[PDB]
Each structure stands twice: as structure tokens, then as C-alpha cells.
């Protein structure tokens, strides 16, 4: 089996689109998820989306059109409203 983790970053006014700032497979995926717990970063399991992002959007790349709406949905779930 092969564990995958995609780390998405979006900051209004900085990133023009959501950015894959980190990825990992196997041991590095496990570590990404441990760190996500530590920093209270929302983690969503979505196996088709994870595999597709992993294949298509490399570290340091903005998401492309196929991903705009699925990633928007994750951002809406995940954003801290800060109150």
C-alpha cells in the first residue's frame, strides 16, 4: 500500500490560486499527517482526489482547472473563521 498526503495553501491576496506547498508518500505522508495533528490543520480523506492531486500537481505548483471546485469545497470546510 502507498500512503499519500497533499498539503494545500491558500491565502487571499497572496496566492492567486490554491498552492500545493508540500506532498508526501509512504513515510513522508505519515509525517505530514502527524504534523497536521500537531498544528491542528484539517485533514480530509478523499482517495480519488488525493491520488489525482498527487499525480498532477507537483510541490510548489498551483492547482489546475480540474481541481478548482473540489479544492474550493475543501477550503470552505477547512478555513478558520478566527472567531
Amino acid at each position: 500500500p502507498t500512503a499519500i498526503a497533499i498539503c494545500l495553501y491558500y491565502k487571499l491576496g497572496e496566492t492567486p490560486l490554491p498552492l500545493v506547498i508540500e506532498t508526501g508518500k509512504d513515510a513522508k505522508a505519515l509525517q505530514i499527517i502527524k504534523l497536521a495533528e500537531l498544528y491542528d490543520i484539517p485533514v480530509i480523506e478523499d482517495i480519488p482526489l488525493a491520488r489525482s492531486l498527487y499525480k498532477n500537481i507537483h510541490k510548489g505548483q498551483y492547482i489546475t482547472e480540474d481541481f478548482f471546485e473540489p479544492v474550493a469545497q475543501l477550503i470552505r470546510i477547512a478555513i478558520d473563521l478566527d472567531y
Binding site: 502507498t2 500512503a3 499519500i4 498526503a5 497533499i6 498539503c7 494545500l8 495553501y9 491558500y10 491565502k11 490554491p18 506547498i21 508540500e22 505522508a29 509525517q31 505530514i32 499527517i33 504534523l35 497536521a36 500537531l38 498544528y39 490543520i41 484539517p42 485533514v43 480530509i44 480523506e45 478523499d46 482517495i47 482526489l49 488525493a50 491520488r51 492531486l53 475543501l74 477550503i75 470546510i77 477547512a78 478555513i79
Partner: peptide, 17 residues
């Protein structure tokens, strides 16, 4: 050292399989 942790700390959301 620490680039990975700093990237995760500032992250918005993680998608996993």
C-alpha cells in the same frame, strides 16, 4: 531543517488517501 514543519503549520488543508 524545519521547512516541512513550517509548511504544514501555515497550511490550509491536507488531503490524504
Amino acid at each position: 531543517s524545519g521547512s516541512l514543519a513550517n509548511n504544514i503549520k501555515k497550511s490550509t488543508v491536507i488531503v490524504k488517501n
